[PDB]
Amino acid sequence: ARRRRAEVRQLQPDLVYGDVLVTAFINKIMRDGKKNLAARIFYDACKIIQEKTGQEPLKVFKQAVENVKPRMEVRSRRVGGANYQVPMEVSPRRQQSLALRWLVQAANQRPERRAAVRIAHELMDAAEGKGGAVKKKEDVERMAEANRAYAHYRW
């Protein structure tokens, strides 16, 4: 992007729940554009939440996301011929993006065999404030105020 900010792609809500946050999540699971599969993964992964948890998976999903959006991050910068890590306040767009992406990158690392399950479980341990999707969060912020020695440049 050089001339404009570039308009962001508006997605189609879900056929089931209707939350576009859903659509975003699946897209992230989808590999090789098999969106028909990626959808099943999420669905059956919700069914696991009803049987193992006495709550509505829609809300569960949200609380999970809500809880992984890191609010602080680092951004490399060559200040005086050197790599100074420059903490900075993260925007709503990027938060949403990072969360989903980590929810899945962590998910697939679980010791579990079935994929729908692996996702289901990450969405649970998430809310409770654990797992690894939330660990990749606290690990980031743990770099934020870690070198908050440098928060005096741009922004």
């Binding site: 020695a149 440098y150 005096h152």
Partner: protein, 115 residues
Amino acid sequence: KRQVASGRAYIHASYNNTIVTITDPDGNPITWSSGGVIGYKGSRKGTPYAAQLAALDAAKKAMAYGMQSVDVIVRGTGAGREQAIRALQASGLQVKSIVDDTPVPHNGCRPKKKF
């Protein structure tokens, strides 16, 4: 314990390290904190954060002597002169007034190569 309420807080800033000394009304230093005393050892001391810390741990040592009121004295231009002051203004000390009495020659010693 020595019970010495209300004192002076000299803040000596540089382009290589910022320090603070807390003295009593008369002018005698009670407890003094630098930057290289906190933990940092080089390029790090010039940082405003370095100064922040230097300021705060320097008050924590004064609260031990029951220090409440303080007049702030700044010496020079460093990197984060401000942050040092703004520090004390939140450390828990009552800040009387900020004084600037940075030492400017009226043309004396011929400064060295880097002016």
